[PDB]
Amino acid sequence: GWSYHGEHGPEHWGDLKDEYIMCKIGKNQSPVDINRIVDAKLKPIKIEYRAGATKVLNNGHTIKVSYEPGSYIVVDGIKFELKQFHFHAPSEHKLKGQHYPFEAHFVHADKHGNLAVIGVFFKEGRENPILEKIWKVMPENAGEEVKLAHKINAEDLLPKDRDYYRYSGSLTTPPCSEGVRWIVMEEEMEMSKEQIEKFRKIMGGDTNRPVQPLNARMIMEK
Amino acid sequence: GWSYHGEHGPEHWGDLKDEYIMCKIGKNQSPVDINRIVDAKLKPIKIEYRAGATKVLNNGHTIKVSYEPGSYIVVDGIKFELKQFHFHAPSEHKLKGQHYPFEAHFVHADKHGNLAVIGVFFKEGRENPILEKIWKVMPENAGEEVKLAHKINAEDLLPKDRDYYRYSGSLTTPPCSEGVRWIVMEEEMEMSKEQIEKFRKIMGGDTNRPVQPLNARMIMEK
Ligand SMILES: [Ca+2]
Ligand SMILES: [Ca+2]
Ligand SMILES: [Ca+2]
Ligand SMILES: [Ca+2]
Ligand SMILES: [Ca+2]
Numbered sequence: 001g002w003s004y005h006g007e008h009g010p011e012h013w014g015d016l017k018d019e020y021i022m023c024k025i026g027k028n029q030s031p032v033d034i035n036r037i038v039d040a041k042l043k044p045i046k047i048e049y050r051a052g053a054t055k056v057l058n059n060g061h062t063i064k065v066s067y068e069p070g071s072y073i074v075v076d077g078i079k080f081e082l083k084q085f086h087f088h089a090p091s092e093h094k095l096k097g098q099h100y101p102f103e104a105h106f107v108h109a110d111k112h113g114n115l116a117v118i119g120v121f122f123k124e125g126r127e128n129p130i131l132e133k134i135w136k137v138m139p140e141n142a143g144e145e146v147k148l149a150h151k152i153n154a155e156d157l158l159p160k161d162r163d164y165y166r167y168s169g170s171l172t173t174p175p176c177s178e179g180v181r182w183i184v185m186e187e188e189m190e191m192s193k194e195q196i197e198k199f200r201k202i203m204g205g206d207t208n209r210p211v212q213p214l215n216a217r218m219i220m221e222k
Numbered sequence: 223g224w225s226y227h228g229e230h231g232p233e234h235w236g237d238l239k240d241e242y243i244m245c246k247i248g249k250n251q252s253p254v255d256i257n258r259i260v261d262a263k264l265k266p267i268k269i270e271y272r273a274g275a276t277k278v279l280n281n282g283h284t285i286k287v288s289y290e291p292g293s294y295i296v297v298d299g300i301k302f303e304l305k306q307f308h309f310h311a312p313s314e315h316k317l318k319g320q321h322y323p324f325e326a327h328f329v330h331a332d333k334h335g336n337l338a339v340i341g342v343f344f345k346e347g348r349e350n351p352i353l354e355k356i357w358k359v360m361p362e363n364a365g366e367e368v369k370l371a372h373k374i375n376a377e378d379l380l381p382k383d384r385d386y387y388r389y390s391g392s393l394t395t396p397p398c399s400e401g402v403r404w405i406v407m408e409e410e411m412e413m414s415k416e417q418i419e420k421f422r423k424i425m426g427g428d429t430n431r432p433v434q435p436l437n438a439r440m441i442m443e444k
């Protein structure tokens with residue numbers, strides 16, 4: 001019964017269930033304000049994506065797009081399979097104290113269940129032609145799920161400059177499990193103001209967890 | 223008789239001499255707050271530098287390091303010869319409303335006198351080993367100029383990531399001539415807090431012109 005507003009909101013997430021305890025005691029939580037940055041010789045990240053987005057689900061907390069097996073990234077010489085991507089507005093991560101109006105998360109998992117999430121910022125700009133295909137068909141109520149007519153390639157929502165920030169964090173929604181590899185891309189993408197407004201309107205407001213303390217962590221920059 | 227403080231300061235520069243009129247009527251002035259940015263497919267910039275820094279001059283307004291002929295950059299298929307590089311603190315340019323504590327300018331000129339300046343931001347970090355060589359020998363008073371023992375290569379003060387912001391602007395000190403190509407590098411370099419403090423102490427304070435209106439301009443990002 002968790003939410004982004006009111007008494008089941010982010011500050012109370014850890015109180016709600018035993019399984020959500022990391023939202024309360026965790027010291028490596030996401031998102032964060034990216035303001036303690038260090039240059040590091042990170043390897044480039046192999047992105048082996050095919051066209052494979054199939055369904056669009058409104059779950060009350062976001063719009064989630066599911067992906068068929070076969071698409072993956074390689075981080076630390078390990079294959080993490082793309083499972084789904086979804087959205088928040090405004091951005092969950094901040095960059096040196098500032099938000100973007102929107103952020104996408106591409107959620108991946110290796111064979112043992114370890115999670116790697118690619119985060120992509122979006123600013124106000126040209127209509128995103130890939131997001132229009134999903135937005136046209138966006139379910140208006142929680143629980144609804146539409147099948148997509150044409151399969152979408154998620155690689156088209158990623159920038160061509162693939163320099164990125166890296167850090168060790170968590171899921172941004174309960175249970176907020178830790179041990180998540182975060183790959184936040186430096187280069188932003190574009191969306192129309194209308195697309196942003198539609199997403200906010202349908203979600204009913206802000207869909208962003210507050211930034212959490214960096215604590216012992218640093219953010220690595222390629 | 224211009225300065226960075228008081229009644230001969232930046233707000234009054236255009237009042238001081240007829241030759242300084244651009245500081246008053248100019249609509250394409252530098253520096254600027256880099257907050258209206260557009261992605262653009264800018265060509266990479268050829269940097270053909272040799273070891274060639276010879277002298278270190280304190281001129282009351284900065285520390286200026288002079289360069290022997292033979293080192294150049296290529297912008298718009300034109301050779302601009304490196305003449306000198308110098309410093310300001312805090313940064314002249316801002317990035318999305320925020321300063322860096324220090325900024326370097328590498329001043330170049332083509333055969334007809336057209337200026338191209340490469341700007342490099344520096345943050346607090348490790349001692350810069352190339353700046354230490356200059357700092358050791360830094361003239362304490364205006365008018366003084368020391369010959370360097372060992373020639374320095376300016377290329378070592380530039381980042382290895384050479385993605386850059388570009389815009390059309392001006393000199394940041396009187397006469398503030400326009401028609402200057404600005405190449406401001408995206409990746410920052412590092413300096414020690416001690417090196418910054420030494421430069422500020424010797425200059426006697428802030429050495430940065432206030433940001434000027436972007437006006438009709440955009441900033442291009444590679
Ligand atoms: Ca950096
Ligand atoms: Ca880059
Ligand atoms: Ca972009
Ligand atoms: Ca950009
Ligand atoms: Ca750096």
Ligand SMILES: [Zn+2]
Nearest residue numbers: 086088105172
């Ligand atoms: Zn998310």
Ligand SMILES: [Zn+2]
Nearest residue numbers: 308310327394
């Ligand atoms: Zn300068």
